Amino acid sequence: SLGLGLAAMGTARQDVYDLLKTNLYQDDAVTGEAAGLALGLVMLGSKNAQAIEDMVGYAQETQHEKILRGLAVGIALVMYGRMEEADALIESLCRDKDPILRRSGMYTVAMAYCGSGNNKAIRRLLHVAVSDVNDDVRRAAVESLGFILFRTPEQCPSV
Amino acid sequence: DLYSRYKKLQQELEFLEVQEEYIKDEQKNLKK
Amino acid sequence: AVQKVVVHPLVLLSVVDHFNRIGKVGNQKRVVGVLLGSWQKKVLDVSNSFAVPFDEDDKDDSVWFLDHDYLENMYGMFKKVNARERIVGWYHTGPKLHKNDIAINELMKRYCPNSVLVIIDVKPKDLGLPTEAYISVEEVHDDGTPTSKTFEHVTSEIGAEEAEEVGVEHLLRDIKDTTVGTLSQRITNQVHGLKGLNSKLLDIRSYLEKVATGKLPINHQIIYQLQDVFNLLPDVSLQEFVKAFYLKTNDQMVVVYLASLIRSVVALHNLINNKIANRDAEKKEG
Amino acid sequence: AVDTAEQVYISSLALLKMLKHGRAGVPMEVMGLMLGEFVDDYTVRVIDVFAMPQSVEAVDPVFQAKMLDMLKQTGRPEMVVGWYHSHPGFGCWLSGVDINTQQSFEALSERAVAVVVDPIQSVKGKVVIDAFRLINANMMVLGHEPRQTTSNLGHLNKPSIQALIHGLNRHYYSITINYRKNELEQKMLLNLHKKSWMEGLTLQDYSEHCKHNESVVKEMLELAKNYNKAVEEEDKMTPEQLAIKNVGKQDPKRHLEEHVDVLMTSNIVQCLAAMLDTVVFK
Ligand SMILES: [Zn+2]
């Protein structure tokens, strides 16, 4: 289930995404890994807005942690290298109080800004690096720089 | 180089300024 | 009279949990429980509270139920576990208190000398102080009311204790806070104050236009009392009031002036202090 | 069947019910039941907390059944998940009898949880909360936890010395705890220290205000008196012998900033509110 989407990661298999959805809607912790990763993995770069709405709409009411984590990565992977439309989701995830969904959004801005040397996201990303309280979204915050610095890799060891 | 001098100094401006705001952030947080 | 009460932060959470308990109905299920407090003084203290089954229909709000049995047993347990604690009143999660709310107090005025109500707000859209409480009285009027009975606003506040401040304030680390922020909490204070002013004015004008025309009772309840509110309205800019300001404002300006005066010199010391150490360590370094 | 990286979900009322109970019964071990829900094989969740009478052996369980009953009919029915008591000023470690109730409890429910609390070592900034989980001795050589993730191993904290001197790994295993916060309680908990517009619109007084400034300026004059002699004094003594002869009664350069700060923050707001009261009003 976890590698299912990583195998079909570039093909964008809507068919496997279908059964992966109902796999994700079991309201359980054992199936959370079953669907939570491959669901977005088979929709890498797909930008399926219904997929975003499914993942974020389901990671608001759960009770377990893995079902929060697989969605935390799937939502960060559903948008791939846009840098111009993922901003609303980056703000929506960073403004949250969820100690995992912020960190989920912290990973997101990295993938929405894959190596993006934009000094715009560096302000508030590397700002919540400062004022951030949760250690999880803090470490995920500082760990987006190299994911946003292939344009000038010599700058990471200076900041 | 000379045009890339003028571009690279520009790039050395804002990326340097974000650190300026950054130390402000760090100091204010450290007070807390 | 009681004239104010001190409610602890445990309650206002021990109500939210129970509103969450029967919160699955969603549409409407008014949460009613028992309030527990102390016969402290004229002022009264509130420490504990608990719930009790309560339902009520939509029409003809005279059909409501408080399990006196459940109240007796559970308070027997809370007395066995705490004689220091005792019943003081009651509460309900109503955002705005209902017309039915007087019959409940009137019922349980036999347990407490006056079972004071407690209105809490799960969703205080107002960023002011929620969870205000009332205590009913009789105000028989010139109109000829056989018993003009209505609740009374009584000021209240949030209790505090060494341990609970410990545990709560350790929980406040989830969000940032500037309580030691110099000359910031004041600015926030006047901000939220003026916000409350504007909110109150918008409310009173909403009522006033409604009563002014079309459909609202035109009773002598407030209509001139609030006129007397207009009676005060101090005419600020006048003859000698100018001497009120300019004879003191510059006084405080003088103190501020002196403070800046010494602050500048104190800041100036470190320039000599570090300009000495820098070059003196440099010339000796080379 | 195997252990995991378990998580202790809490209820915000549970914490306060803990600390108030233990603090009230501070000079002895206060006991109580931990009531919650078994969310899964991985994590646990506590939502309700309550205690009973004790003169540590609990008295009549007739309080037990009626208590849980009336808790079911009002609110809802729930599940007993664990329990708690105090180690006042102690090493927050499962005492000899404390473990002796544990074979009793785990034999009843599998994931029975002990909860240690100390309202003594907890400062207003941070509380010393604790909880443990009994482990068998028959498997003293065999592995007990699979350790399939860093969270309950190299991602949490480090066992303390005064409790490690008792079990630390043995007769039990520690467990992690977090805090789940409903948004409903979260919002109101956000705001409990603000006041109405009256506070933000008060003008304290200019007689005791000017009296106060007249106060602080007076001794501040003397602080400058000392400051002149101290600063000009400067024994060539090295920057640390000054730091050893300054302990004593020496304090220039410290009160000087303080009185200036206070005199600032007073006069500033004192002028400002008077400003607003006239711009806004009439
Ligand atoms: Zn003990």
From Swiss-Prot, chain A:
PC repeats: 1-33, 34-68, 70-103, 104-139, 140-159
Transmembrane segments annotated in the record for this chain: none
Complex and partners: Component of the 19S proteasome regulatory particle complex. The 26S proteasome consists of a 20S core particle (CP) and two 19S regulatory subunits (RP). The regulatory particle is made of a lid composed of 9 subunits, a base containing 6 ATPases and few additional components including PSMD1. Interacts with ADRM1. Interacts with ZFAND1.
Function: Component of the 26S proteasome, a multiprotein complex involved in the ATP-dependent degradation of ubiquitinated proteins. This complex plays a key role in the maintenance of protein homeostasis by removing misfolded or damaged proteins, which could impair cellular functions, and by removing proteins whose functions are no longer required. Therefore, the proteasome participates in numerous cellular processes, including cell cycle progression, apoptosis, or DNA damage repair.
Family the entry assigns: Belongs to the proteasome subunit S1 family.
Protein name per UniProt: 26S proteasome non-ATPase regulatory subunit 1
Natural source organism: Homo sapiens
Covered residues, full protein: 478 to 636 of 953
From Swiss-Prot, chain B:
Subcellular location as annotated: Cytoplasm; Nucleus
Summary of subunit composition and partner proteins: Component of the 19S proteasome regulatory particle complex. The 26S proteasome consists of a 20S core particle (CP) and two 19S regulatory subunits (RP). The regulatory particle is made of a lid composed of 9 subunits, a base containing 6 ATPases including PSMC4 and few additional components. Interacts with NR1I3. Interacts with PAAF1. Interacts with TRIM5. Interacts with ZFAND1.
Family under the similarity heading: Belongs to the AAA ATPase family.
Function: Component of the 26S proteasome, a multiprotein complex involved in the ATP-dependent degradation of ubiquitinated proteins. This complex plays a key role in the maintenance of protein homeostasis by removing misfolded or damaged proteins, which could impair cellular functions, and by removing proteins whose functions are no longer required. Therefore, the proteasome participates in numerous cellular processes, including cell cycle progression, apoptosis, or DNA damage repair.
Protein name: 26S proteasome regulatory subunit 6B
Organism of origin: Homo sapiens
Gene field: PSMC4
Full-protein residues shown: 39 to 70 of 418
Curated annotation (Swiss-Prot), chain C:
Residue ranges constituting the MPN domain according to the UniProt record: 5-140
Location in chain, cross-link Glycyl lysine isopeptide (Lys-Gly) (interchain with G-Cter in ubiquitin): 176
A Pfam short name: MitMem_reg
Keyword Ubl conjugation attached: yes
SMART domains, alphabetized: JAB_MPN
GO cellular component terms attached to this protein's record: cytosol; extracellular exosome; extracellular region; ficolin-1-rich granule lumen; membrane; nucleoplasm; nucleus; proteasome complex
Coiled-coil region(s): none
One MF term in the entry's GO annotations: protein homodimerization activity
One annotated GO biological process: proteasome-mediated ubiquitin-dependent protein catabolic process
CDD domains in the record: MPN_RPN7_8
Record keywords, A-Z: Acetylation, Isopeptide bond, Proteasome, Ubl conjugation
Sites of N6-acetyllysine modification: 200, 210
PANTHER family membership: 26S PROTEASOME NON-ATPASE REGULATORY SUBUNIT 7, EUKARYOTIC TRANSLATION INITIATION FACTOR 3 SUBUNIT F-RELATED
Note: Does not bind a metal ion.
Family the UniProt entry places it in: Belongs to the peptidase M67A family.
Summary of the function given for this chain in its UniProt record: Component of the 26S proteasome, a multiprotein complex involved in the ATP-dependent degradation of ubiquitinated proteins. This complex plays a key role in the maintenance of protein homeostasis by removing misfolded or damaged proteins, which could impair cellular functions, and by removing proteins whose functions are no longer required. Therefore, the proteasome participates in numerous cellular processes, including cell cycle progression, apoptosis, or DNA damage repair.
Descriptive protein name: 26S proteasome non-ATPase regulatory subunit 7
UniProt source species: Homo sapiens
Lineage: Eukaryota, Metazoa, Chordata, Craniata, Vertebrata
Encoding gene per record: PSMD7
Swiss-Prot record, chain D:
Distribution of this protein across tissues and organs: Widely expressed. Highest levels in heart and skeletal muscle.
EC number(s) recorded for this UniProt protein: 3.4.19.-
Ranges for domain MPN: 8-138
Sorted UniProt keywords: DNA damage, DNA repair, Hydrolase, Metal-binding, Metalloprotease, Phosphoprotein, Protease, Proteasome, Ubl conjugation pathway, Zinc
Pfam families, A to Z: JAB, RPN11_C
Top EC group: hydrolase
Entry-annotated residues carrying Phosphothreonine: 238
SMART domains (UniProt xref): JAB_MPN
One GO term describing the cellular component: secretory granule lumen
UniProt motif (JAMM motif) ranges: 85-98
Record-listed Phosphoserine modification sites: 122, 196
Protein origin, superkingdom: Eukaryota
Residues involved in Zn(2+) binding: 85, 87, 98
Function: Component of the 26S proteasome, a multiprotein complex involved in the ATP-dependent degradation of ubiquitinated proteins. This complex plays a key role in the maintenance of protein homeostasis by removing misfolded or damaged proteins, which could impair cellular functions, and by removing proteins whose functions are no longer required. Therefore, the proteasome participates in numerous cellular processes, including cell cycle progression, apoptosis, or DNA damage repair.
Similarity comment: family membership: Belongs to the peptidase M67A family. PSMD14 subfamily.
Descriptive protein name: 26S proteasome non-ATPase regulatory subunit 14
Organism: Homo sapiens
Gene name, Swiss-Prot/TrEMBL: PSMD14
